[PDB]
Structure 1
Amino acid sequence: TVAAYNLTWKSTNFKTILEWEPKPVNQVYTVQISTKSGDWKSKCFYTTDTECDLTDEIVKDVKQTYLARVFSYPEPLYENSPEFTPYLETNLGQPTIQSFEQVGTKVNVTVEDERTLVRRNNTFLSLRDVFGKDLIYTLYYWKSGKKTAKTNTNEFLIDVDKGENYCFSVQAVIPSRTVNRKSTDSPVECM
Protein backbone atom coordinates (compact mmCIF):
# COMPACT_ATOMS: atom_id res chain seq x y z
CA THR A 1 0.00 0.00 0.00
CA VAL A 2 0.87 3.66 -0.45
CA ALA A 3 -0.08 6.47 1.91
CA ALA A 4 -2.53 8.95 0.44
CA TYR A 5 -1.15 12.36 -0.52
CA ASN A 6 -2.26 15.85 -1.53
CA LEU A 7 -5.19 15.71 0.88
CA THR A 8 -7.31 18.75 0.02
CA TRP A 9 -10.50 20.29 1.37
CA LYS A 10 -13.22 21.20 -1.11
CA SER A 11 -15.83 23.20 0.77
CA THR A 12 -18.51 25.64 -0.38
CA ASN A 13 -21.30 26.95 1.81
CA PHE A 14 -20.15 24.27 4.24
CA LYS A 15 -20.66 21.36 1.85
CA THR A 16 -17.27 19.88 2.73
CA ILE A 17 -15.46 17.10 0.89
CA LEU A 18 -11.98 15.69 1.45
CA GLU A 19 -10.11 14.63 -1.67
CA TRP A 20 -6.78 12.89 -2.15
CA GLU A 21 -4.49 10.80 -4.34
CA PRO A 22 -3.79 8.45 -5.89
CA LYS A 23 -6.46 6.48 -7.74
CA PRO A 24 -6.41 3.33 -5.53
CA VAL A 25 -4.87 0.19 -7.01
CA ASN A 26 -5.33 -2.93 -4.89
CA GLN A 27 -6.00 -0.69 -1.88
CA VAL A 28 -9.05 0.70 -0.10
CA TYR A 29 -9.43 3.70 2.24
CA THR A 30 -11.12 4.68 5.50
CA VAL A 31 -11.25 8.26 6.76
CA GLN A 32 -11.20 9.59 10.32
CA ILE A 33 -12.06 13.13 11.41
CA SER A 34 -12.02 14.90 14.75
CA THR A 35 -11.42 18.05 16.75
CA LYS A 36 -8.14 18.40 18.67
CA SER A 37 -9.78 17.19 21.89
CA GLY A 38 -12.42 14.84 20.51
CA ASP A 39 -12.40 11.17 19.61
CA TRP A 40 -11.66 10.02 16.09
CA LYS A 41 -14.74 9.18 14.05
CA SER A 42 -14.47 6.96 10.97
CA LYS A 43 -16.12 7.82 7.66
CA CYS A 44 -16.37 6.41 4.13
CA PHE A 45 -15.50 2.90 5.29
CA TYR A 46 -13.33 0.89 2.89
CA THR A 47 -14.11 3.14 -0.06
CA THR A 48 -12.23 2.88 -3.35
CA ASP A 49 -13.08 6.50 -4.09
CA THR A 50 -10.48 9.20 -3.56
CA GLU A 51 -13.00 11.49 -1.87
CA CYS A 52 -15.04 11.56 1.32
CA ASP A 53 -17.96 13.78 2.29
CA LEU A 54 -17.51 15.13 5.84
CA THR A 55 -20.29 17.72 5.66
CA ASP A 56 -22.55 16.13 8.27
CA GLU A 57 -19.62 16.07 10.67
CA ILE A 58 -18.30 19.65 10.31
CA VAL A 59 -21.69 21.39 10.39
CA LYS A 60 -22.06 20.15 13.97
CA ASP A 61 -19.85 23.08 14.97
CA VAL A 62 -18.54 25.08 12.01
CA LYS A 63 -16.25 27.08 14.31
CA GLN A 64 -14.26 24.09 15.53
CA THR A 65 -10.96 23.27 13.85
CA TYR A 66 -10.95 19.81 12.28
CA LEU A 67 -8.24 17.38 11.30
CA ALA A 68 -8.80 14.36 9.11
CA ARG A 69 -6.56 11.47 8.09
CA VAL A 70 -6.80 8.80 5.41
CA PHE A 71 -5.91 5.19 6.20
CA SER A 72 -4.70 2.90 3.42
CA TYR A 73 -5.38 -0.84 3.29
CA PRO A 74 -4.03 -3.45 0.84
CA GLU A 75 -1.13 0.42 12.66
CA PRO A 76 -2.02 1.15 8.98
CA LEU A 77 -0.41 3.64 6.63
CA TYR A 78 -2.06 7.05 6.66
CA GLU A 79 -1.68 10.74 5.93
CA ASN A 80 -3.00 13.72 7.85
CA SER A 81 -4.92 16.45 6.06
CA PRO A 82 -4.48 20.19 6.57
CA GLU A 83 -6.45 21.57 9.51
CA PHE A 84 -9.84 22.89 8.48
CA THR A 85 -11.92 25.55 10.20
CA PRO A 86 -15.24 25.71 8.26
CA TYR A 87 -16.29 29.19 9.42
CA LEU A 88 -12.96 30.70 8.35
CA GLU A 89 -12.42 28.66 5.19
CA THR A 90 -15.62 27.45 3.53
CA ASN A 91 -15.94 29.28 0.21
CA LEU A 92 -18.91 31.58 -0.19
CA GLY A 93 -21.12 30.27 -2.98
CA GLN A 94 -21.91 32.36 -6.06
CA PRO A 95 -24.62 34.87 -5.08
CA THR A 96 -27.92 35.42 -6.87
CA ILE A 97 -29.69 38.75 -7.29
CA GLN A 98 -33.24 38.03 -6.16
CA SER A 99 -34.72 41.26 -7.47
CA PHE A 100 -34.71 45.02 -7.78
CA GLU A 101 -37.53 47.52 -7.83
CA GLN A 102 -37.30 51.15 -8.85
CA VAL A 103 -38.90 53.82 -6.69
CA GLY A 104 -38.54 57.17 -8.40
CA THR A 105 -34.84 58.00 -8.44
CA LYS A 106 -33.75 55.03 -6.33
CA VAL A 107 -33.42 51.28 -6.80
CA ASN A 108 -33.61 48.50 -4.23
CA VAL A 109 -31.35 45.57 -5.11
CA THR A 110 -32.13 42.45 -3.10
CA VAL A 111 -29.70 39.56 -2.78
CA GLU A 112 -31.10 36.05 -2.35
CA ASP A 113 -30.17 34.79 1.12
CA GLU A 114 -29.01 31.38 -0.12
CA ARG A 115 -28.99 28.34 2.13
CA THR A 116 -26.00 26.42 3.50
CA LEU A 117 -25.55 22.80 4.55
CA VAL A 118 -25.72 23.72 8.24
CA ARG A 119 -28.82 22.04 9.64
CA ARG A 120 -30.86 23.45 12.52
CA ASN A 121 -34.15 22.12 13.87
CA ASN A 122 -34.83 20.16 10.67
CA THR A 123 -33.97 23.08 8.36
CA PHE A 124 -31.05 24.55 6.44
CA LEU A 125 -29.58 27.79 7.77
CA SER A 126 -28.83 30.68 5.44
CA LEU A 127 -25.46 32.35 4.96
CA ARG A 128 -26.81 35.19 7.08
CA ASP A 129 -28.02 32.90 9.87
CA VAL A 130 -24.50 31.45 10.09
CA PHE A 131 -22.23 34.46 9.57
CA GLY A 132 -24.52 37.14 10.95
CA LYS A 133 -22.64 40.46 11.02
CA ASP A 134 -19.50 38.86 9.59
CA LEU A 135 -21.20 38.81 6.20
CA ILE A 136 -21.67 41.76 3.86
CA TYR A 137 -22.55 42.04 0.20
CA THR A 138 -20.82 44.27 -2.32
CA LEU A 139 -22.41 45.64 -5.47
CA TYR A 140 -20.60 46.30 -8.75
CA TYR A 141 -22.93 48.14 -11.12
CA TRP A 142 -22.85 50.62 -13.99
CA LYS A 143 -25.10 52.90 -16.02
CA SER A 144 -25.60 50.85 -19.18
CA GLY A 145 -17.83 53.98 -15.57
CA LYS A 146 -17.63 51.67 -12.56
CA LYS A 147 -19.73 51.89 -9.40
CA THR A 148 -19.83 49.96 -6.11
CA ALA A 149 -21.93 49.71 -2.97
CA LYS A 150 -21.83 47.74 0.29
CA THR A 151 -24.48 46.49 2.70
CA ASN A 152 -24.49 44.57 5.97
CA THR A 153 -27.86 43.11 5.01
CA ASN A 154 -29.12 41.42 1.85
CA GLU A 155 -30.18 44.62 0.09
CA PHE A 156 -28.68 47.68 -1.61
CA LEU A 157 -30.50 51.02 -1.88
CA ILE A 158 -28.83 53.17 -4.54
CA ASP A 159 -29.44 56.27 -6.67
CA VAL A 160 -30.04 56.09 -10.42
CA ASP A 161 -30.55 58.41 -13.38
CA LYS A 162 -34.17 58.44 -14.53
CA GLY A 163 -34.47 56.93 -17.99
CA GLU A 164 -31.05 55.28 -18.08
CA ASN A 165 -30.67 51.54 -17.47
CA TYR A 166 -28.27 49.85 -15.07
CA CYS A 167 -26.70 46.42 -14.74
CA PHE A 168 -25.88 44.81 -11.41
CA SER A 169 -23.63 42.15 -9.93
CA VAL A 170 -22.96 41.20 -6.32
CA GLN A 171 -20.46 39.25 -4.25
CA ALA A 172 -20.70 37.65 -0.82
CA VAL A 173 -17.92 38.86 1.48
CA ILE A 174 -16.61 38.17 4.97
CA PRO A 175 -14.35 41.21 5.63
CA SER A 176 -12.50 39.75 8.61
CA ARG A 177 -11.41 36.71 6.61
CA THR A 178 -7.86 36.41 5.33
CA VAL A 179 -8.41 33.69 2.73
CA ASN A 180 -11.50 33.04 0.60
CA ARG A 181 -12.78 36.47 1.63
CA LYS A 182 -14.96 36.81 -1.46
CA SER A 183 -17.33 34.68 -3.52
CA THR A 184 -17.28 34.75 -7.31
CA ASP A 185 -19.41 37.44 -8.97
CA SER A 186 -23.11 36.69 -9.36
CA PRO A 187 -24.81 36.54 -12.75
CA VAL A 188 -25.34 39.99 -14.27
CA GLU A 189 -28.83 41.47 -14.14
CA CYS A 190 -30.14 44.60 -15.85
CA MET A 191 -33.29 46.65 -15.44
Structure 2
Amino acid sequence: TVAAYNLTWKSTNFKTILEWEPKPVNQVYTVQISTKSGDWKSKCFYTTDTECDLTDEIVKDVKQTYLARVFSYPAGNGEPLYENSPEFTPYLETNLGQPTIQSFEQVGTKVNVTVEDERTLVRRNNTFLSLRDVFGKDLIYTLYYWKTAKTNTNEFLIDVDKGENYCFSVQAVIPSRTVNRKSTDSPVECM
Protein backbone atom coordinates (compact mmCIF):
# COMPACT_ATOMS: atom_id res chain seq x y z
CA THR A 1 0.00 0.00 0.00
CA VAL A 2 0.92 3.62 -0.57
CA ALA A 3 -0.38 6.74 1.02
CA ALA A 4 -3.05 8.33 -1.23
CA TYR A 5 -1.73 11.65 -2.53
CA ASN A 6 -3.11 14.68 -4.38
CA LEU A 7 -6.37 15.34 -2.61
CA THR A 8 -8.51 18.12 -4.28
CA TRP A 9 -12.03 19.29 -3.37
CA LYS A 10 -14.46 19.44 -6.32
CA SER A 11 -17.35 21.62 -5.08
CA THR A 12 -19.96 23.37 -7.18
CA ASN A 13 -23.29 24.41 -5.71
CA PHE A 14 -22.56 22.45 -2.54
CA LYS A 15 -22.12 19.10 -4.27
CA THR A 16 -18.71 18.21 -2.88
CA ILE A 17 -16.64 15.29 -4.11
CA LEU A 18 -13.17 14.79 -2.68
CA GLU A 19 -10.90 12.98 -5.04
CA TRP A 20 -7.37 11.74 -4.78
CA GLU A 21 -4.77 9.60 -6.47
CA PRO A 22 -3.63 6.89 -7.40
CA LYS A 23 -5.65 4.02 -9.01
CA PRO A 24 -5.56 1.24 -6.35
CA VAL A 25 -3.30 -1.83 -6.65
CA ASN A 26 -4.25 -4.33 -3.91
CA GLN A 27 -5.83 -1.37 -2.07
CA VAL A 28 -9.21 -0.19 -1.06
CA TYR A 29 -9.93 3.04 0.73
CA THR A 30 -12.29 4.44 3.27
CA VAL A 31 -12.89 8.10 3.67
CA GLN A 32 -13.30 9.98 6.95
CA ILE A 33 -14.39 13.59 7.32
CA SER A 34 -15.04 15.76 10.35
CA THR A 35 -15.47 19.28 11.71
CA LYS A 36 -12.15 20.24 13.36
CA SER A 37 -13.24 19.54 16.96
CA GLY A 38 -15.83 16.84 16.28
CA ASP A 39 -16.00 13.10 15.73
CA TRP A 40 -14.75 11.45 12.50
CA LYS A 41 -17.54 10.20 10.23
CA SER A 42 -16.82 7.19 7.98
CA LYS A 43 -17.77 7.36 4.25
CA CYS A 44 -17.12 5.37 1.04
CA PHE A 45 -16.23 2.00 2.46
CA TYR A 46 -13.37 0.01 0.87
CA THR A 47 -13.83 1.72 -2.41
CA THR A 48 -11.85 0.92 -5.57
CA ASP A 49 -12.88 4.42 -6.73
CA THR A 50 -10.33 7.18 -6.24
CA GLU A 51 -13.06 9.66 -5.21
CA CYS A 52 -15.68 10.10 -2.50
CA ASP A 53 -18.86 12.13 -2.24
CA LEU A 54 -18.93 14.12 1.00
CA THR A 55 -21.95 16.09 -0.10
CA ASP A 56 -24.29 14.78 2.54
CA GLU A 57 -22.01 15.81 5.37
CA ILE A 58 -21.11 19.38 4.42
CA VAL A 59 -24.70 20.35 3.68
CA LYS A 60 -25.43 19.85 7.37
CA ASP A 61 -23.95 23.27 8.30
CA VAL A 62 -22.33 24.89 5.26
CA LYS A 63 -20.25 27.40 7.20
CA GLN A 64 -18.22 24.75 9.17
CA THR A 65 -14.67 23.95 8.09
CA TYR A 66 -14.20 20.27 7.29
CA LEU A 67 -11.03 18.11 7.17
CA ALA A 68 -10.76 14.71 5.58
CA ARG A 69 -8.57 11.75 5.15
CA VAL A 70 -8.14 8.78 2.98
CA PHE A 71 -7.28 5.49 4.58
CA SER A 72 -5.27 2.90 2.64
CA TYR A 73 -5.83 -0.81 3.37
CA PRO A 74 -4.53 -4.05 1.82
CA ALA A 75 -6.56 -6.68 0.04
CA GLY A 76 -8.16 -9.14 2.43
CA ASN A 77 -9.25 -6.55 4.94
CA GLY A 78 -1.57 -0.77 14.42
CA GLU A 79 -3.01 2.18 12.48
CA PRO A 80 -3.56 2.44 8.70
CA LEU A 81 -1.53 4.42 6.21
CA TYR A 82 -3.40 7.64 5.37
CA GLU A 83 -3.25 11.13 3.99
CA ASN A 84 -5.08 14.27 5.16
CA SER A 85 -6.78 16.88 2.98
CA PRO A 86 -7.01 20.59 3.12
CA GLU A 87 -9.38 22.40 5.47
CA PHE A 88 -12.47 23.08 3.40
CA THR A 89 -15.16 25.60 4.45
CA PRO A 90 -17.79 25.23 1.75
CA TYR A 91 -19.64 28.60 2.01
CA LEU A 92 -16.35 30.19 0.99
CA GLU A 93 -14.93 27.66 -1.40
CA THR A 94 -17.76 25.93 -3.28
CA ASN A 95 -18.14 27.19 -6.86
CA LEU A 96 -21.25 28.97 -8.08
CA GLY A 97 -22.72 27.15 -11.07
CA GLN A 98 -23.57 28.42 -14.62
CA PRO A 99 -26.69 30.61 -14.41
CA THR A 100 -29.33 30.39 -17.06
CA ILE A 101 -31.47 33.28 -18.27
CA GLN A 102 -34.99 31.97 -17.99
CA SER A 103 -36.84 34.79 -19.63
CA PHE A 104 -36.67 38.45 -20.61
CA GLU A 105 -39.80 40.54 -20.98
CA GLN A 106 -39.71 43.87 -22.90
CA VAL A 107 -42.12 46.01 -20.88
CA GLY A 108 -41.93 49.01 -23.20
CA THR A 109 -38.85 51.20 -22.80
CA LYS A 110 -37.18 48.76 -20.38
CA VAL A 111 -36.48 45.06 -20.47
CA ASN A 112 -36.58 42.68 -17.54
CA VAL A 113 -34.13 39.80 -17.65
CA THR A 114 -35.22 37.10 -15.21
CA VAL A 115 -32.56 34.67 -14.06
CA GLU A 116 -33.51 31.08 -13.28
CA ASP A 117 -33.15 30.10 -9.63
CA GLU A 118 -29.85 28.14 -9.04
CA ARG A 119 -30.65 25.12 -6.91
CA THR A 120 -28.06 23.89 -4.41
CA LEU A 121 -27.78 20.45 -2.72
CA VAL A 122 -28.96 21.72 0.68
CA ARG A 123 -32.08 19.46 0.62
CA ARG A 124 -33.88 21.52 3.29
CA ASN A 125 -37.50 20.44 4.11
CA ASN A 126 -37.89 18.29 0.96
CA THR A 127 -36.96 20.55 -1.91
CA PHE A 128 -33.42 21.79 -2.45
CA LEU A 129 -32.72 25.41 -1.63
CA SER A 130 -31.43 27.97 -4.14
CA LEU A 131 -28.12 29.88 -3.90
CA ARG A 132 -30.05 32.95 -2.72
CA ASP A 133 -31.70 31.00 0.10
CA VAL A 134 -28.18 30.08 1.19
CA PHE A 135 -26.01 33.12 0.38
CA GLY A 136 -28.77 35.69 0.58
CA LYS A 137 -27.42 39.19 1.01
CA ASP A 138 -23.99 37.87 -0.19
CA LEU A 139 -25.16 36.88 -3.64
CA ILE A 140 -25.61 39.21 -6.58
CA TYR A 141 -26.35 38.19 -10.13
CA THR A 142 -24.53 40.34 -12.80
CA LEU A 143 -25.60 40.90 -16.41
CA TYR A 144 -23.49 41.76 -19.48
CA TYR A 145 -25.46 43.04 -22.46
CA TRP A 146 -24.99 44.46 -25.91
CA LYS A 147 -23.03 47.05 -21.23
CA THR A 148 -23.17 45.85 -17.59
CA ALA A 149 -25.74 45.55 -14.80
CA LYS A 150 -26.09 44.38 -11.16
CA THR A 151 -28.89 42.89 -9.02
CA ASN A 152 -29.60 41.66 -5.42
CA THR A 153 -32.34 39.36 -6.78
CA ASN A 154 -32.83 37.25 -9.90
CA GLU A 155 -34.02 39.99 -12.35
CA PHE A 156 -32.50 43.13 -13.88
CA LEU A 157 -34.64 46.02 -15.16
CA ILE A 158 -32.53 47.57 -17.89
CA ASP A 159 -33.31 50.72 -19.90
CA VAL A 160 -32.99 49.71 -23.59
CA ASP A 161 -33.49 51.44 -26.97
CA LYS A 162 -36.68 51.32 -29.04
CA GLY A 163 -36.59 48.75 -31.87
CA GLU A 164 -32.88 47.95 -31.38
CA ASN A 165 -33.18 44.37 -29.97
CA TYR A 166 -30.21 43.38 -27.68
CA CYS A 167 -28.31 40.29 -26.36
CA PHE A 168 -27.72 38.98 -22.83
CA SER A 169 -25.34 36.95 -20.58
CA VAL A 170 -25.46 36.58 -16.74
CA GLN A 171 -22.98 35.53 -13.99
CA ALA A 172 -23.27 34.38 -10.36
CA VAL A 173 -21.10 36.46 -8.10
CA ILE A 174 -20.30 36.59 -4.36
CA PRO A 175 -18.55 39.94 -4.06
CA SER A 176 -16.92 39.33 -0.66
CA ARG A 177 -14.64 36.52 -1.82
CA THR A 178 -11.03 37.26 -2.78
CA VAL A 179 -10.78 34.20 -4.92
CA ASN A 180 -13.51 32.02 -6.57
CA ARG A 181 -15.83 35.10 -6.70
CA LYS A 182 -17.78 34.46 -9.91
CA SER A 183 -19.25 31.62 -11.93
CA THR A 184 -18.90 30.84 -15.60
CA ASP A 185 -21.08 32.88 -17.93
CA SER A 186 -24.47 31.83 -19.21
CA PRO A 187 -25.60 30.80 -22.69
CA VAL A 188 -26.24 34.06 -24.52
CA GLU A 189 -29.87 34.86 -25.41
CA CYS A 190 -30.89 37.75 -27.74
CA MET A 191 -34.25 39.53 -28.35
TM-score by length of 1: 0.97
- Structure 1 residue 116: Cα displacement: 0.5
Alignment of 1:1-191 (within 5 A): 1-74=1-74, 75-142=79-146, 147-191=147-191
Deviation, structure 1 residue 179? 1.8
Deviations 1:117-148 (A, max 9, x none): 00111220001100001000111110xxxx00
Instruction: Kindly provide the CA deviation profile for residues 5-54 of structure 1, in whole angstroms up to 9, marking residues without a partner as x.
Output: 11000010000000000011111100000001110001000001000000
Please state how far the C-alpha of 1:165 moved relative to its aligned partner.
1.2
Aligned-pair distance for 1:185?
A: 0.1
Provide the secondary structure at the position in 2 that maps to 1:6.
coil
In the TM superposition, residue 186 of structure 1 has moved relative to its aligned partner by 0.5
- Residue by residue over 1:44-101, the C-alpha shift from the partner in whole angstroms, topping out at 9 and shown as x without a partner, is 0000100000000000000000000000011101000111111001000000001110
Question: Matched residues in 2 for 1:188 and 1:129: separation?
Answer: 25
SS at match of 1:5: coil
Give the CA deviation at 1:103. 1.2
Deviation for aligned residue 1:114: 1.6
Structure 1 segments of 4+ aligned residues over 6 angstroms from their partners:
none
Aligned length: 187
CA distance in 2, matches of 1:179, 1:5: 24
Q: Partners in 2 of 1:52 and 1:179 — Cα distance?
A: 25
- The sequence identity of aligned pairs, in percent, is 100
Distance 2:127 2:108 in 1: 38
1: CA distance between counterparts of 2:127 and 2:143?
A: 29
SS of residue in 2 equivalent to 1:131: helix
Q: CA deviation at 1:178?
A: 1.6
Two-structure CA RMSD over aligned residues (Å): 0.6
CA distance in 2, matches of 1:103, 1:121: 36
Deviation of residue 180 (structure 1)?
A: 1.1
1: CA distance between counterparts of 2:134 and 2:160?
Answer: 33
Question: 2:42, 2:175 → 1: CA distance?
Answer: 35
Between Structure 1 and Structure 2, the one with more strand by share is 1
Give the Cα–Cα distance (whole angstroms) in 2 for the partners of residues 109 and 81 of structure 1: 41
Q: Distance in 2 between matches of 1:33 and 1:159?
A: 50
Unaligned runs of 5+ in 1: none
**Secondary structure of the residue that 2:120 maps to in structure 1?**
strand
Partner Cα distance (2:8, 2:178) in 1: 18
Q: Structure 2 regions of 5+ residues with no counterpart?
A: none
For 2:26 and 2:167, locate their aligned partners in 1 and report how far apart those are by CA, in whole Å: 55
